[PDB]
Amino acid sequence: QAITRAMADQARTIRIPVHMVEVINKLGRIQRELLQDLGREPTPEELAKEMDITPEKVLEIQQYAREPISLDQTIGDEGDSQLGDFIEDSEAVVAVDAVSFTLLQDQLQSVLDTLSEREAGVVRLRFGLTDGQPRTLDEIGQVYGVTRERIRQIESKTMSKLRHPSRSQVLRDYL
Amino acid sequence: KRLKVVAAFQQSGNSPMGMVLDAVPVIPPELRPMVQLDGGRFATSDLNDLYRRVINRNNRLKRLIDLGAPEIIVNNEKRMLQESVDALFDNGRRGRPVTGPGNRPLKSLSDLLKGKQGRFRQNLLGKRVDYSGRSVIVVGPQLKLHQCGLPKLMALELFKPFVMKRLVDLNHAQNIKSAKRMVERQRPQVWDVLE
Amino acid sequence: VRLTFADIELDEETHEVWKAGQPVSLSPTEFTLLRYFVINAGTVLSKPKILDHVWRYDFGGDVNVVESYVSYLRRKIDTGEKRLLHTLRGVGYVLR
Amino acid sequence: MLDVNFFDELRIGLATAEDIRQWSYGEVKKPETINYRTLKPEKDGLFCEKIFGPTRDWECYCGKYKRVRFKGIICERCGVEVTRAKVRRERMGHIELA
Amino acid sequence: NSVPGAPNRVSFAKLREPLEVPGLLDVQTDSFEWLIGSPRWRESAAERGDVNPVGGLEEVLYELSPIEDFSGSMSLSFSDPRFDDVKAPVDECKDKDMTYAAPLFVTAEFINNNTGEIKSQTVFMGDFPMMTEKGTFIINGTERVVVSQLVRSPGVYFDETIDKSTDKTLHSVKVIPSRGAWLEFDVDKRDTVGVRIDRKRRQPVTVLLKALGWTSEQIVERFGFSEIMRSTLEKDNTVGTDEALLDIYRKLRPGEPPTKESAQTLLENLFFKEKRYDLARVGRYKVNKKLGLHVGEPITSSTLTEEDVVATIEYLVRLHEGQTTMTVPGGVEVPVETDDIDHFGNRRLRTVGELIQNQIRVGMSRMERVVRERMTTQDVEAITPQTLINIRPVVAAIKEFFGTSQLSQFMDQNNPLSGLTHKRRLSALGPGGLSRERAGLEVRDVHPSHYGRMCPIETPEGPNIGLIGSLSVYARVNPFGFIETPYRKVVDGVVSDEIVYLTADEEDRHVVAQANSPIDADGRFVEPRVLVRRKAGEVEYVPSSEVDYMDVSPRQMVSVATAMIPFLEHDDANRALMGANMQRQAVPLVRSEAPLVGTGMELRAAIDAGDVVVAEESGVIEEVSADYITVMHDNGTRRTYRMRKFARSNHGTCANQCPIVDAGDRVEAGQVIADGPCTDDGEMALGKNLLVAIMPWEGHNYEDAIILSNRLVEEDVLTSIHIEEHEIDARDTKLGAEEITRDIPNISDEVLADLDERGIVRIGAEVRDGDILVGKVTPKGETELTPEERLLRAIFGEKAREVRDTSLKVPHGESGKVIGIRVFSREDEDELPAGVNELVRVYVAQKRKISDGDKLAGRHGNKGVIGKILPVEDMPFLADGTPVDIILNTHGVPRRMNIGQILETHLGWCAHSGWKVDAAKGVPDWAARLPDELLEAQPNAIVSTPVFDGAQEAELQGLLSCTLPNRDGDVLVDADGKAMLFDGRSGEPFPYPVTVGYMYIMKLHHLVDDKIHARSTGPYSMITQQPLGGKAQFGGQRFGEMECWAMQAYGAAYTLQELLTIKSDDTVGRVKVYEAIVKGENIPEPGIPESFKVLLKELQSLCLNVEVLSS
Ligand SMILES: [Zn+2]
């Protein structure tokens, strides 16, 4: 009991609960028994019949059972470089979309300035451009001394005039 | 030969207590990344295995001493912990190295410093570098001495920010996104501005 | 341009939903929830997806609002024998 | 010590337990790396957000804060400091040997 | 010709060989037949060594059986390893990524002796991968070849050394068995004899002999002359068999208390028990032959024996005493001499069958362990062979070999030559052999025993020079893995027609004569003294009445690729090596014209490479199309050969096949029916015949560069088809399932025009860089929506677009047409990897024309890139007006000693123009020995020059003399092979005649399109922010330490700072520099590289208090 509990709790790089390790080992054992008996490998539906659970959960268990590989094992046919020399940095800054983002920021500033100051401020505080919070209609109402209904109408009017062909075409290429 | 270390300890402010360790540090996780490659398969940096081994041995030892056990059991656990720490820093310096799947040794901390393929030489003095290319060499007998003939496609790829900025200056594109598209499709309005 | 999944038939332009010829009137919130479910048939949508799209971003309340709305939609259009709007615990909801 | 390419000297010496604990931003005590189901780092594991920094930028362990405004304020539910995930490339911890 | 459909190829060979070239795939086919146990191999063993015909699988089964328990009252055994019909045909297996395999069954017998029980069961042992008729394995749709490797044969090896302290001559012996513990003996600097066993450096022979049940009296009685170790025995300082046993025990097994019986049982168990120590049958044979132990006895009891050990010691002491002959008691007299480790009589060849048998041995060792454990655990009288056997270790082991082992490699198929050279190749790496980190110069050298066994010219050129070679064209593998070569025998100084195959062991005991010796048509040589090879690899002259062997033919010492080099003997060794190494890199063109000058080897090479369809039964041809050929056999039945077209090989080259037959002609068995990629009329053709001038021209052919006419571009003389495949898979994921659909968010319409409703590009729709091949869209949901995205969908009306587009796009830098598509899905029963529900592969072809930067080569190692393609008008043209096709520089020939290419040029011009030797008054003197039917050749004839019985210089000069005019009466090429050219640029005739001719030029697989790279900004690595490397990723060049040194040497500091900081590691510097360069301001100051910070934290994690001090 101690050895098996410790194996379940410590053998894998990614910890797997014992309740799932038990089913993984049972699935593997009976699948190899079935292969030996039948002469061919058992299909997922056949294995699900013995698991008394659905083939979707059988496949989920199968893909759960996979283990990681080392980032430093030699990938080349000879020993020249490690697998870690072939993996990209997903989280790294692509360094060309940053320039696109800042220039689109400037263009959005200009387009907002094309509109009236009241509507521009309403949209800014409504979508969170000056700060991080896109405020609510009540907040813009209390900061502008105006009713929330009039705010809704001013937002709709602002959006209608913002739909205008030059603004739409100018912003469209930035995507 | 004994004084050349004893006097070194005496002269400075260091303390020979530094030889032994009560706590070991842990490298930041990004320096030992774990990432999912294409196909769902996972990849670890091979250092987390050594760290996991050390953690397991230490936790088991503390459980043993807090539960009460024969000194031979406790000493075996302590020896295992010491060997785990020695494997962490230097895998294979003492005895056979700890090996993973495929009967290959796990790379330890010092293993990423020593050697030509180690950090100091393969990664710090040398460096992979941007704005660079390569290709085969042909003779240019009609060139001048201060001159070299460069492929137009590779030159376009190399000078890409320069040419994109100049071509948006010439108004052939409205923005850098349009400029990047006409760079990728290599439209005829880029070749003349390339020169 | 008619949104469909087997039993459920949603039309945007006329703004009502059919169960194989059975229309029922729904609340606007639940209507947007059903529409942006049906356009993502067979795909898991997590709680932040749901809240950010159907509700506005500035929804500063607690999440069980979507729980109650999924209950509404289940007792309304799932009321058939088969269960379509299934739930993946700790992940989200899928109509399938 | 500010990373401004103005370095008058670079010194090396033996490290003591006090220096190790000073470097450490926490103690790691669980040999767990990543959750097998939600693919998120475990608490007190080898990748713990509380010890090493948040995995995603400007996000807590559960996502209670998801805005750039919360600068250097630790989550009361999780204990993670809201900052750039690149601190995980610099933040280091330690373990205590029995 | 001995081949029914052979085109006539007049030859300059003077001598007639006795025996024809063997089947060139015998090395693999015979080995696999031995492993399996086919009736063909049964007959072979019956006719040769019928004393014990046993296959590899039968042998491993009989060795493993019987498996016993501790009680011994019940046991298990294996018998009758039988196969079954293969799963699917080779084409099917290659199509659907299966493995060309077959079931295997074993008749397991479980016996119970306590009461008497026999249980017979046909247990399914697994699905054994099979070998195709062309000698390759098909694994997961890939053609893999298992190259035979070279390892020292296990056995006993003696060596001699000089101490250099007193110039004392020391002698040592090593008994190195496969799968055992070493045995060692030596004589020390003093008279003491050391027996350091299992790396335990003590124990003179006295203790071992005493522990072997021998006494000092027996030792002095048997071994009396050995005064050296007699003195050693007098200094035994240990008497008593028990004392010696305890000494050996306390040395080899420290930490355990010796016992009376553990010592004896351990000494026996270490060597004399086959469970822990066994030389293979080859090792036992080697020891027996070395020591003359058994000469008329069969091989059994493969483990070591005590009398073998004592014979080894006797041999060592006799050798150190200066003896030259010994007779072991009960054994035959044998010479006493040291052994060479690199002699091919000791370097055996592990072939495919042996490697497979060893892997099976490992798998079945695990089998035996598991079955013994289960047979102990499970209850008796309720146990079955099926319940006992668990084939998983065996199948896992065979898979683990056949994939991911450096002795199993992709069968490179740029051309049939490359395939046939990857097979019949001898490597020296992999498990069980030395590695590139271990190679010695003595290993890399050419041993004199190589002659006729392994080619000394054909070998890789890079760092692994000398560790990889090729079998000689006439070579064969002995039943024990030793390479043997045929040779004729001379009796009474007359050469018989009898051919015997001789191994390097018996060659030293003979004096083998030369292939091209002046035979007298009766058996005698014209000169008494002939040049031959003696015992020690020396070459000397010998009276003719004393030689005893002779070479079967010339080219016996050469490989299959090198034997296709004309005028080989006129080429330097290393240049010929380069030519042979480039013969196998030539791409297949669209025509593949047969060379004007060649050797007779091309026909057999094309036949045996398996890339040419052959009529397996003689008959008429009923109907022929571009895809199939039907033949009407004599005996009523008809056969259909399907012909593969435009199939991509492992290296992205076309494998088109074309019929060369009519609709009514009859064909014989073995005749070529349809030619392959690099073949013409059934003979290998790797290039094209080009009209060449060898003058330097305007510096465009400076330093090995090559110039060509533009008509080579226009007429598609040098052009190739390059087919590339792209894969993408739709796989399930946590959020749902990715789907391949033409509906892909935020995409234009013209780029969707080539996409059908399925979502995959239409067949035949041409494609270019950046386009979509497969529209595959993935379920992502939503992420942090930046304010600007919300503003955009508000302003214009952008929708949810909840999905992400990870569509298949063509990789950067290629285009072309789309051939075909294969689509796999689970809904169509197709077996797929778990988690993937749809797989798509897309095939793209480019008809690549010849261009500058591409690499051309002759057959003589004269390679070069294309400096400039020249307009057809601006080329040197003969007086007839025909422009030359290719120009090579003349400074490259005399420096490199490859005059054979010029000989080929002259003979090629002669063969292109035709000739007639005027036999008005007899034949001239040079043509006296020239063969008939060669005195007169029509224009555009084809000639064969065998590599060493080639065309003599006098014959070639005489041929050049009479070179009948082309169209009108004009001899453009004069007596000495030169001609007068007109400069196509200035028009004035060239002041001096230059040589012109026809040379065979081939295009190598080094096209500039596959070697051009540029990078401005791409991916970066994770641990350190350095850019990636290689064309697979976006690359980034390596600025190494040498480049850093050069930059410091210039004194240039700022560019070094920029090359290290803001181009590779400083992340903020990278982003800021990109912003500055796009906006138009000067580059900002660099920061601190990220790699240095990584190093700082790394050193900190090693308990080093390292910090930076600012003042
Ligand atoms: Zn939190």
mmCIF file of C-alpha atoms in Angstrom, chain E residues 382-597:
data_model
loop_
_atom_site.group_PDB
_atom_site.id
_atom_site.type_symbol
_atom_site.label_atom_id
_atom_site.label_comp_id
_atom_site.label_asym_id
_atom_site.label_seq_id
_atom_site.Cartn_x
_atom_site.Cartn_y
_atom_site.Cartn_z
ATOM 1 C CA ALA E 382 -4.378 -24.175 -14.045
ATOM 2 C CA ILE E 383 -1.605 -22.547 -16.109
ATOM 3 C CA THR E 384 -1.573 -22.217 -19.902
ATOM 4 C CA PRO E 385 1.114 -21.126 -22.382
ATOM 5 C CA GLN E 386 -1.203 -18.311 -23.477
ATOM 6 C CA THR E 387 -1.583 -17.165 -19.868
ATOM 7 C CA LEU E 388 2.212 -17.368 -19.483
ATOM 8 C CA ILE E 389 3.459 -15.504 -22.571
ATOM 9 C CA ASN E 390 3.170 -11.688 -22.754
ATOM 10 C CA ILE E 391 4.633 -10.471 -26.056
ATOM 11 C CA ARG E 392 4.766 -6.769 -25.126
ATOM 12 C CA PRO E 393 8.534 -6.653 -24.355
ATOM 13 C CA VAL E 394 9.331 -8.423 -27.638
ATOM 14 C CA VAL E 395 7.203 -6.151 -29.816
ATOM 15 C CA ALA E 396 8.442 -3.083 -27.927
ATOM 16 C CA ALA E 397 12.074 -4.117 -28.441
ATOM 17 C CA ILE E 398 11.696 -4.728 -32.171
ATOM 18 C CA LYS E 399 9.904 -1.390 -32.584
ATOM 19 C CA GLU E 400 12.571 0.352 -30.488
ATOM 20 C CA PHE E 401 15.237 -0.964 -32.826
ATOM 21 C CA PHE E 402 13.485 -0.404 -36.152
ATOM 22 C CA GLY E 403 12.854 3.207 -35.127
ATOM 23 C CA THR E 404 15.342 5.590 -33.503
ATOM 24 C CA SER E 405 18.581 3.651 -34.013
ATOM 25 C CA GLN E 406 21.469 5.096 -35.999
ATOM 26 C CA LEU E 407 21.946 1.750 -37.764
ATOM 27 C CA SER E 408 18.443 2.173 -39.272
ATOM 28 C CA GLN E 409 18.327 5.229 -41.536
ATOM 29 C CA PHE E 410 16.093 6.722 -44.207
ATOM 30 C CA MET E 411 16.889 5.138 -47.569
ATOM 31 C CA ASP E 412 17.955 8.265 -49.442
ATOM 32 C CA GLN E 413 16.594 8.021 -52.976
ATOM 33 C CA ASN E 414 17.752 11.011 -54.984
ATOM 34 C CA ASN E 415 18.450 8.260 -57.517
ATOM 35 C CA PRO E 416 18.749 4.471 -57.852
ATOM 36 C CA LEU E 417 22.512 4.850 -57.350
ATOM 37 C CA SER E 418 21.920 6.540 -53.995
ATOM 38 C CA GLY E 419 19.529 3.779 -52.963
ATOM 39 C CA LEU E 420 21.862 0.982 -54.061
ATOM 40 C CA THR E 421 24.772 2.682 -52.288
ATOM 41 C CA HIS E 422 22.849 3.179 -49.050
ATOM 42 C CA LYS E 423 22.282 -0.529 -49.217
ATOM 43 C CA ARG E 424 25.487 -2.564 -49.548
ATOM 44 C CA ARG E 425 27.186 -0.050 -47.232
ATOM 45 C CA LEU E 426 29.466 -0.807 -44.277
ATOM 46 C CA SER E 427 29.229 1.566 -41.317
ATOM 47 C CA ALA E 428 31.379 1.566 -38.184
ATOM 48 C CA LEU E 429 29.188 3.481 -35.709
ATOM 49 C CA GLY E 430 26.226 2.665 -33.490
ATOM 50 C CA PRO E 431 25.956 0.565 -30.334
ATOM 51 C CA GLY E 432 28.696 -2.028 -29.994
ATOM 52 C CA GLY E 433 31.231 -0.080 -32.056
ATOM 53 C CA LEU E 434 33.514 2.917 -31.841
ATOM 54 C CA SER E 435 32.064 6.396 -32.320
ATOM 55 C CA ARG E 436 33.230 9.575 -34.044
ATOM 56 C CA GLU E 437 34.391 10.839 -30.627
ATOM 57 C CA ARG E 438 36.475 7.648 -30.398
ATOM 58 C CA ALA E 439 37.839 7.078 -33.919
ATOM 59 C CA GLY E 440 41.546 6.385 -34.268
ATOM 60 C CA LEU E 441 43.624 7.249 -37.310
ATOM 61 C CA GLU E 442 44.688 3.600 -37.511
ATOM 62 C CA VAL E 443 40.988 2.718 -37.697
ATOM 63 C CA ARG E 444 40.406 5.311 -40.424
ATOM 64 C CA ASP E 445 43.363 4.021 -42.458
ATOM 65 C CA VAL E 446 43.107 1.605 -45.386
ATOM 66 C CA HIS E 447 44.169 -1.848 -44.315
ATOM 67 C CA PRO E 448 45.747 -4.049 -47.023
ATOM 68 C CA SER E 449 43.117 -6.698 -46.244
ATOM 69 C CA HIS E 450 40.501 -4.326 -47.709
ATOM 70 C CA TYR E 451 41.374 -5.364 -51.280
ATOM 71 C CA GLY E 452 38.247 -6.959 -52.713
ATOM 72 C CA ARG E 453 36.325 -6.665 -49.424
ATOM 73 C CA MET E 454 35.584 -2.959 -48.919
ATOM 74 C CA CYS E 455 36.242 -0.135 -51.353
ATOM 75 C CA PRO E 456 39.092 2.272 -50.486
ATOM 76 C CA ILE E 457 37.761 5.111 -52.680
ATOM 77 C CA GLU E 458 34.013 5.290 -51.963
ATOM 78 C CA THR E 459 33.547 6.815 -48.501
ATOM 79 C CA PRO E 460 32.035 9.964 -46.957
ATOM 80 C CA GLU E 461 34.283 13.010 -47.027
ATOM 81 C CA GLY E 462 33.361 14.869 -43.834
ATOM 82 C CA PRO E 463 34.396 14.169 -40.239
ATOM 83 C CA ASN E 464 33.348 10.503 -40.592
ATOM 84 C CA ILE E 465 35.961 9.903 -43.304
ATOM 85 C CA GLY E 466 37.012 6.262 -43.210
ATOM 86 C CA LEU E 467 34.320 5.024 -40.812
ATOM 87 C CA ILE E 468 31.831 4.360 -43.640
ATOM 88 C CA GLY E 469 32.636 2.429 -46.802
ATOM 89 C CA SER E 470 30.976 0.225 -49.410
ATOM 90 C CA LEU E 471 31.173 -3.472 -50.178
ATOM 91 C CA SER E 472 33.377 -4.344 -53.116
ATOM 92 C CA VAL E 473 31.344 -5.222 -56.186
ATOM 93 C CA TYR E 474 32.274 -8.926 -55.931
ATOM 94 C CA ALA E 475 32.145 -9.243 -52.142
ATOM 95 C CA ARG E 476 30.177 -11.805 -50.141
ATOM 96 C CA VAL E 477 29.458 -12.461 -46.464
ATOM 97 C CA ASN E 478 30.585 -15.733 -44.929
ATOM 98 C CA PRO E 479 28.117 -17.585 -42.684
ATOM 99 C CA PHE E 480 29.998 -16.190 -39.663
ATOM 100 C CA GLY E 481 29.919 -12.537 -40.744
ATOM 101 C CA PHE E 482 33.373 -12.362 -42.357
ATOM 102 C CA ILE E 483 33.698 -10.700 -45.758
ATOM 103 C CA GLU E 484 35.047 -13.057 -48.428
ATOM 104 C CA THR E 485 35.847 -12.415 -52.085
ATOM 105 C CA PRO E 486 36.196 -14.755 -55.077
ATOM 106 C CA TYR E 487 39.481 -15.636 -56.741
ATOM 107 C CA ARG E 488 40.693 -18.078 -59.374
ATOM 108 C CA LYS E 489 43.377 -20.679 -58.692
ATOM 109 C CA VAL E 490 46.527 -21.386 -60.706
ATOM 110 C CA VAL E 491 47.959 -24.916 -60.847
ATOM 111 C CA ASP E 492 51.232 -25.712 -62.652
ATOM 112 C CA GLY E 493 51.314 -22.016 -63.512
ATOM 113 C CA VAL E 494 48.091 -22.423 -65.507
ATOM 114 C CA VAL E 495 44.949 -20.594 -64.394
ATOM 115 C CA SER E 496 41.939 -22.856 -63.963
ATOM 116 C CA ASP E 497 38.307 -21.874 -64.380
ATOM 117 C CA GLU E 498 37.713 -22.983 -60.784
ATOM 118 C CA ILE E 499 36.545 -20.149 -58.529
ATOM 119 C CA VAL E 500 36.888 -20.330 -54.746
ATOM 120 C CA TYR E 501 35.721 -17.715 -52.251
ATOM 121 C CA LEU E 502 38.538 -16.705 -49.909
ATOM 122 C CA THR E 503 38.459 -14.884 -46.575
ATOM 123 C CA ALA E 504 41.285 -12.640 -45.388
ATOM 124 C CA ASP E 505 42.319 -15.438 -43.015
ATOM 125 C CA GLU E 506 43.435 -17.802 -45.788
ATOM 126 C CA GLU E 507 44.650 -15.047 -48.131
ATOM 127 C CA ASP E 508 47.788 -14.563 -46.030
ATOM 128 C CA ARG E 509 48.465 -18.295 -46.474
ATOM 129 C CA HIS E 510 48.472 -17.788 -50.256
ATOM 130 C CA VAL E 511 50.109 -15.672 -52.959
ATOM 131 C CA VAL E 512 47.366 -14.110 -55.097
ATOM 132 C CA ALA E 513 48.345 -12.941 -58.591
ATOM 133 C CA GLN E 514 47.058 -9.959 -60.611
ATOM 134 C CA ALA E 515 43.861 -9.535 -62.608
ATOM 135 C CA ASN E 516 45.362 -7.946 -65.742
ATOM 136 C CA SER E 517 48.230 -10.345 -66.243
ATOM 137 C CA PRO E 518 49.477 -11.284 -69.729
ATOM 138 C CA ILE E 519 47.660 -14.606 -70.022
ATOM 139 C CA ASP E 520 48.628 -16.808 -72.979
ATOM 140 C CA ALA E 521 45.128 -18.152 -73.831
ATOM 141 C CA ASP E 522 46.350 -21.440 -72.298
ATOM 142 C CA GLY E 523 46.993 -20.633 -68.630
ATOM 143 C CA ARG E 524 50.571 -19.362 -68.540
ATOM 144 C CA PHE E 525 51.885 -15.835 -68.047
ATOM 145 C CA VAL E 526 54.400 -14.460 -70.529
ATOM 146 C CA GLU E 527 56.839 -13.249 -67.881
ATOM 147 C CA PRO E 528 58.285 -15.500 -65.154
ATOM 148 C CA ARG E 529 58.098 -12.751 -62.512
ATOM 149 C CA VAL E 530 54.583 -11.432 -61.852
ATOM 150 C CA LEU E 531 53.555 -8.677 -59.435
ATOM 151 C CA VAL E 532 51.437 -10.119 -56.608
ATOM 152 C CA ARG E 533 50.440 -9.575 -52.975
ATOM 153 C CA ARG E 534 52.255 -11.699 -50.398
ATOM 154 C CA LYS E 535 51.256 -12.715 -46.865
ATOM 155 C CA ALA E 536 51.927 -9.470 -44.978
ATOM 156 C CA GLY E 537 50.138 -7.238 -47.489
ATOM 157 C CA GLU E 538 53.389 -6.590 -49.352
ATOM 158 C CA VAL E 539 53.532 -6.390 -53.149
ATOM 159 C CA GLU E 540 56.442 -8.099 -54.902
ATOM 160 C CA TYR E 541 57.550 -10.016 -57.982
ATOM 161 C CA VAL E 542 57.397 -13.812 -57.965
ATOM 162 C CA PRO E 543 58.244 -16.635 -60.406
ATOM 163 C CA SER E 544 55.065 -17.673 -62.195
ATOM 164 C CA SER E 545 55.359 -21.321 -61.129
ATOM 165 C CA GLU E 546 54.915 -20.369 -57.448
ATOM 166 C CA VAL E 547 51.716 -18.290 -57.311
ATOM 167 C CA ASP E 548 48.540 -20.078 -56.215
ATOM 168 C CA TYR E 549 45.709 -17.560 -56.728
ATOM 169 C CA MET E 550 44.650 -14.834 -59.146
ATOM 170 C CA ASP E 551 42.058 -12.070 -59.207
ATOM 171 C CA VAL E 552 38.708 -12.881 -60.791
ATOM 172 C CA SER E 553 38.628 -9.579 -62.681
ATOM 173 C CA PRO E 554 39.657 -5.920 -62.503
ATOM 174 C CA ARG E 555 37.360 -3.637 -60.453
ATOM 175 C CA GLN E 556 37.335 -6.372 -57.802
ATOM 176 C CA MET E 557 38.810 -3.813 -55.376
ATOM 177 C CA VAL E 558 36.216 -1.140 -56.188
ATOM 178 C CA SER E 559 32.678 -0.333 -55.064
ATOM 179 C CA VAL E 560 29.559 -0.134 -57.235
ATOM 180 C CA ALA E 561 29.424 3.669 -57.511
ATOM 181 C CA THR E 562 33.145 4.136 -58.167
ATOM 182 C CA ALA E 563 33.051 1.406 -60.827
ATOM 183 C CA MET E 564 30.869 3.821 -62.825
ATOM 184 C CA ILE E 565 33.696 6.371 -63.192
ATOM 185 C CA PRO E 566 35.322 6.165 -66.646
ATOM 186 C CA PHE E 567 39.119 6.369 -66.797
ATOM 187 C CA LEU E 568 39.278 5.771 -63.045
ATOM 188 C CA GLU E 569 42.935 4.720 -63.203
ATOM 189 C CA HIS E 570 43.796 8.132 -64.695
ATOM 190 C CA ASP E 571 42.281 9.968 -61.705
ATOM 191 C CA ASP E 572 43.900 10.780 -58.382
ATOM 192 C CA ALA E 573 42.609 8.888 -55.361
ATOM 193 C CA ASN E 574 40.957 11.779 -53.518
ATOM 194 C CA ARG E 575 39.438 13.336 -56.647
ATOM 195 C CA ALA E 576 38.031 9.924 -57.573
ATOM 196 C CA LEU E 577 36.692 9.740 -54.013
ATOM 197 C CA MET E 578 34.941 13.082 -54.523
ATOM 198 C CA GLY E 579 33.524 11.918 -57.851
ATOM 199 C CA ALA E 580 32.186 8.693 -56.356
ATOM 200 C CA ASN E 581 30.671 10.661 -53.471
ATOM 201 C CA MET E 582 28.932 13.055 -55.872
ATOM 202 C CA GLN E 583 27.645 10.267 -58.129
ATOM 203 C CA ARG E 584 24.972 9.614 -55.486
ATOM 204 C CA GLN E 585 23.783 13.229 -55.072
ATOM 205 C CA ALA E 586 22.742 13.859 -58.685
ATOM 206 C CA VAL E 587 19.059 14.785 -58.948
ATOM 207 C CA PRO E 588 16.827 13.028 -61.510
ATOM 208 C CA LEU E 589 16.207 15.247 -64.529
ATOM 209 C CA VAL E 590 13.223 14.998 -66.888
ATOM 210 C CA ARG E 591 15.065 13.031 -69.603
ATOM 211 C CA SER E 592 18.122 11.204 -68.174
ATOM 212 C CA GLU E 593 20.066 10.634 -71.377
ATOM 213 C CA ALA E 594 22.455 7.686 -71.211
ATOM 214 C CA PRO E 595 26.125 8.756 -71.128
ATOM 215 C CA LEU E 596 28.105 8.637 -74.351
ATOM 216 C CA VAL E 597 31.076 7.083 -72.525
#
